[PDB]
Amino acid sequence: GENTLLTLITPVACVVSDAITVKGFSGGADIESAAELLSRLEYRVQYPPFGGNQFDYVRWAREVSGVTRAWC
Amino acid sequence: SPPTLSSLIARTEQNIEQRLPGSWPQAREKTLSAIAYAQAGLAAGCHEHISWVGRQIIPSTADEDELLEHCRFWGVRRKQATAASGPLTVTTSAATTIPAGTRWQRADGVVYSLADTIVIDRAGTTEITVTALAAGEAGNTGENTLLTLITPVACVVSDAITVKGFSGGADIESAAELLSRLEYRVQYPPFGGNQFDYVRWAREVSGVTRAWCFPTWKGGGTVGVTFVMDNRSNIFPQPADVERVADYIAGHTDPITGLIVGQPDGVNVTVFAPKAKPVNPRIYISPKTAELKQAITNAINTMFFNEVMPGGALAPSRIIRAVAGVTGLDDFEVRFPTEIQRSENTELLTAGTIEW
Amino acid sequence: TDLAIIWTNGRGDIAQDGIDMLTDDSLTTDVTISLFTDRRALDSDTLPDGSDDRRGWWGDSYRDRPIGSRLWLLSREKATPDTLERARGYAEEALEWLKTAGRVSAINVRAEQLHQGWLYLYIALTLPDGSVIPYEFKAAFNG
Amino acid sequence: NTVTLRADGRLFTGWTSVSVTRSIESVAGYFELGVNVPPGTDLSGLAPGKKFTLEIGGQIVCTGYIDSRRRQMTADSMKITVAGRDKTADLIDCAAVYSGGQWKNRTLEQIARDLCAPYGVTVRWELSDKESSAAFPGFTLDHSETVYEALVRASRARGVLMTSNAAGELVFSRAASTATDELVLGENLLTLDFEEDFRDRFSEYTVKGYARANGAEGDDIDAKSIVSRKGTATDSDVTRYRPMIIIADSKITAKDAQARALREQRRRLAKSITFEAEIDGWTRKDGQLWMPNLLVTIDASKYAIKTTELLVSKVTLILNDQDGLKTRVSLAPREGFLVPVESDRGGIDALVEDYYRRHPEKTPPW
Amino acid sequence: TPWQTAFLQLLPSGLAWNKSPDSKLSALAQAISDVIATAADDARQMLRERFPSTSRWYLGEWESFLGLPDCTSENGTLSERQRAAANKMRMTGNLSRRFYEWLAAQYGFTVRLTDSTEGQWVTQVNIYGIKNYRNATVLDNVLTPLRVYESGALECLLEKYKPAHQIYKFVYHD
Amino acid sequence: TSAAVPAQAVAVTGSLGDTLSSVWQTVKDGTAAATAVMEAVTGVIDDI
Amino acid sequence: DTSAAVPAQAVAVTGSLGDTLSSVWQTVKDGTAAATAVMEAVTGVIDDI
Amino acid sequence: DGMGLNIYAGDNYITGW
Amino acid sequence: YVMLAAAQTYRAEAASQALTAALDFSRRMDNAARAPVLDAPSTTTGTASG
Amino acid sequence: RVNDSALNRLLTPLMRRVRLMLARAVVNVINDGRKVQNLQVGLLDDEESDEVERLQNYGHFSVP
DSSP states (O other): OTTOOBOOSSOOTTOOSOBOOSSOOOOOOOOOOHHHHHHHHHHHHHOOOOOOOHHHHHHHHHSSTTOOOOOO | OOOOHHHHHHHHHHHHHHHSTTOOTTSSSOHHHHHHHHHHHHHHHHHHHHHHHSSOSSTTTOOHHHHHHHHHHHTOOOOOOOOOEEEOOEEESSSEEEOTTOEEEBTTSOEEEEOSOEEEOSSSEEOOEEEESSOSGGGOOOSSEEEOOSSOOSSEEEEEEESSOOBOOOOOOOHHHHHHHHHHHHHSOOOSSSHHHHHHHHHHSTTOOEEEEETTSSSSSBOEEEEEOSSSSSOSOOHHHHHHHHHHHHOEEOTTTOOEEOOOSSOBOOOBOOEEEEEOOOBOOSSOOHHHHHHHHHHHHHHHHHHOOTTOOBOHHHHHHHHHTOSSOSOOOBOSOOSOBOOOTTEEEEEOOOOO | OEEOEEEETTEEEEOEETTEEOEEOSHHHHHHHHHSSBOOOOSSOOOSSSSOOOOOOTTTTTSSSOOSBSGGGGSSOOSOHHHHHHHHHHHHHHHHHHHHTTSOSOEEEEEEEETTTEEEEEEEEOOOTTOOOOOOOOOBOOO | OOEEEEOSSSOOOOOSEEEEEEESSSSOOOEEEEEOOOTTOOOOSSOTTOEEEEEETTEEEEEEEBOOOOEEEOSSOEEEEEEEOOSGGGTTSSBOOOSSSEESSBOHHHHHHHHSTTTOOOEEEOOOOSSTTOOBSOEEOOTTOBHHHHHHHHHHHHOOOEEEOTTSOEEEOOOOOSEEEEEETTTSOSOEEEEEOOSSOOSEEEEEOOOOOSSGGGGTOOSHHHHOOOEEEEOSSOOSOOEEEEEOSSSOOHHHHHHHHHHHHHHHHHHHEEEEEEESOSBOSSSSBOOSSOEEEEEOTTTTOOOOEEEEEEEEEEOOTTTOSEEEEEEEOGGGSOOTTOOOOOOHHHHHHHHHHHOTTSOOOO | OHHHHHHHHHSOOSSSOOOOTTSHHHHHHHHHHHHHHHHHHHHHHHHHHTSTTTOSTTHHHHHHHHTOOSTTSOSSOHHHHHHHHHHHTTOOOOSOHHHHHHHHHHTTOOEEEEOOSSSSSOOEEEEOSOOOEEEOOSSSOSSSOSEEEOOOHHHHHHHHSSOSSOOOEEEEOO | OOTTHHHHHHHHHHHHHHHHHHHOOOOOTTSHHHHHHHHHHHHHHHHO | OOTTSHHHHHHHHHHHHHHHHHHHOOOOOOOSHHHHHHHHHHHHHHHHO | OHHHHHHHSOOSSOSOO | OHHHHHHHHHHHHHHHHHHHHHHHHHOOSOOSOOOOOOOOSOSSSSOOOO | OOSHHHHHHHHHHHHHHHHHHSOOOEEEEEEOSSSSOEEEEEOSSSOEEEEEEOOOOTTOOOOO
């Protein structure tokens, strides 16, 4: 969480064994639940084919990380 | 700005760890963690109560009852509601006595009750004066309206049509209006002879929307006042309005103390009315439509009502901002007002007809 | 799994263990709380003190049952069988709330005078077949 | 927890036997006390016509006027009693007085407030419905009709049930919504009585009457539809044919007919199934007294009863010597005291109204 | 601490419990009660916030409601902002020279309104003890200089609150 | 308890509705802010 | 019932005070200082109320 | 008199008529 | 004189009523050794909704 | 329904309706604009009745 104190394990030259973490750690997701997996499977089953369309090219270009605007 | 619940959890855990050295209360599924969470919840409730105790210190953010108490302490007095009244012209069929307290209801549901008993000795219409029981803005009606009869009378036709409608229906001032009046009072202190004093004097009289005061108008011993009534269509004073405003500034009783207050005895006020100085812009619109005509006109009117003062100079950018405030149009280039227009104190700027 | 009460110098207190406090999930804490906290004396009882105050807890009117035991009435007694009988009765009354529920099957408490100046109480319960193994400790002294 | 009778002038605290009654199936709550005094003392503070206020502990249960006082003495016994009702019972035996017997376009609350003005009873309207506030196109008063008769006649057509408050007011009550107390067979019951008789509940209640043709509607309505009006309400608890036909009470439309048909079906449901219990304490679990219009959770499952929630219908408090402190609480299903709009648990207007009906403490848009 | 004493007194009384000032119950009671101690401190400081003369959290709101930010409120000194708010909230008075001297001196300045020199309406504001230095207090920021030099605060104040008919004439003395 | 859950659900829904009604603010009709708010509300309706 | 004995006595006190005022009031027929001062006193009381 | 008192008290559900 | 006397009598009656109001609000009808439960509606006094 | 007065209270409304079914009246106002004549009649005492329709046989008409 917030302001959690951490210490080193193996000493390093000119490094003090102190870590503050002003911003808490984020993440920590456990395994998927049965309902979530069922929903993912139903998405896979029910999703349609997406043939190359002027709308679909925008999504395909925008899915790459970093790309924020696209035009077709 | 009370601390959040997570911040309270962290603070309680830090306190526990500081007081018990060598401990780590952040561990999952542990007694110290549970205790810290419970104490954090209690402290969050307490801090929310503290925040509610705050936020009512000032009348602006106070709740309803505390705002009313603040206004009553500061001396703001409410205006009570009135009741509508007028003639009825009820038609009978024989000699009868309409007892006092009878009621005529209009389609909407409002009920108008006769005050004094009336005795009729003919088979013809008779005019009686009735007053509403609602006591609100809904009391007053149009010119020829119909009123039915809640309970029948001995020989009176149920329907009753009023040739000349009722009038005198008003509403009690709302808390928003009371707050605005108190805010104005606090923002502009009363001194008895200041420019703000003259402005508030010229504004307190009924029907006046805006006023301005020029100190040392025509020398070191005189002042000047100029008021503009915006409710009326003309929006420029009349001689009767000017003389009545001069009378009000000269002398009027104070509702609080009951004594009469006014201008000093050595000054010359000479309140007067402004003269219109219209400006006619020429704005080009890409889509020409009545909706854009109305929107641009209303924006310009409001722009003037906001940022125009007698004797002041308005930059051409103001018109540009007012016309750009509209949504539908695409281009709004103005052509006539390309230079700064200025005027004297007697001259008041006004938005003339726009030549599209 | 609440905190456990540990006796040192004749006075119990909560204790730590590694990171946090020591925890207990057995009848030991329940018995050591139901036996050694003073509950409200009756109106007609004669207090051992010369005072007029009766102990208890501000939560006795919030917890549906008086908290502890009336063993504090025997603070200053002489070596007579009456005090032993009273101590036996008070322990039985304090711990009968367990037998009322299903947490114990039978209670057997006896009182005796061991080496001169000792009020010895022997309380033996009968835990049922499913009850967890209770905690185990001894009173300790230091300094 | 003393029962003090604030009579005209002074307090009276000690009593020999107290019996108080309250219900939502009635327009008054009657009380009867027993007084014991030496033969010859002056008993004038307890006289017929005095203004009484019964106060249990520090709370007022009934207020009104004293009705009767009995005094008897035989060769070996002596008994004196006193009785009374609410101030709402003043309307029951008093004839309604109004100048014009006809109200053209008024709602039930306004009619009641115009009728209960000369006496002193204050009317209270609790329902937030949009159809229960629908104005009467015309309502006339039969001469020599009591206020109780007139208001009951109107409330039956509206579907509302009329009751008397604990402070003497008239109330057009609203059924409770949140389950507050619990009654179980093992903990806090001395005696139960569960009667379930089906000698009155039918399958299809259908009401027939006459349409509206007096005046303005007379230029529009035809001849056949004046006489041909109908309304239906079906029950699913009786599996046989079992119909019932009801002649209407006043001028009727289709929606009004449907409302009365349900009103009748729900009243039959309420009168069919009845629970009765005798608890030990006058006070509730929280601490207040036991009063009608409360939703309780029944857990009489050791006697193989499958009812889960009921609504209290009648509460009678007793202070007999042989009894002690008892209060016989009677119970009926909640679905028997509802208005035809609501139900027991097609547009934006329907959604908004639903929301503001599920949340009654909110202010409707009206 | 008194709050830990209150918590210990709230805890049950008996032989099993140790309430001596060195036990684990006390060491945990301090940590448990310190949060409510801070809450009580905040609720107590609300009493000081009640007035604009001493308010620190609600200075922004007391300024927005009063329309305060103007000439008489100095550059950045929180003490001067508080003083301006506390004077504007309770400033009502007459037009006399005595009242104007009192109002000017209530802000820390020193003036006297002497008779005219050329006309009748043109009274002379003789301003004595001119000092443009304002010492940084403990309330204001850590980045503010030790002295803030501000000038012309009294001039526009008196020109704003001057009588409508009259015109002032300012003269600086030492 | 089990009989006191629906009352708490009703109270939570009422409180959430009140907080939405008290926090929601109006915006100008022709702006991208209005467009984004329209899209979000339409998406919520689509999910329901 | 001491709570309900205060208004009953207050009603009688108010009635007696009103009767005393009505009895002791004397009409002044002049238009001089007496009449104008009586007018000032009455209008002062109305102002307070 | 269980029914004899319900007449003197009100009855929002009409017995007859 | 008459006006003062009337004002003071009305003040006395108002005080007598205010005492009843204060005593009414001060006292609560709980007075029982019970156990708190998880009662969702009306966390603080009041009445149950509906 | 054991006492004389209780029986009287129970049986009164039926007889009141029976006695009030048929009635006499006087005519004060006649309105002929409607397709059926609307009278304004006056019942026993302190009782009016507005908009009371009059029924007349087919083929005959009259305005009293």
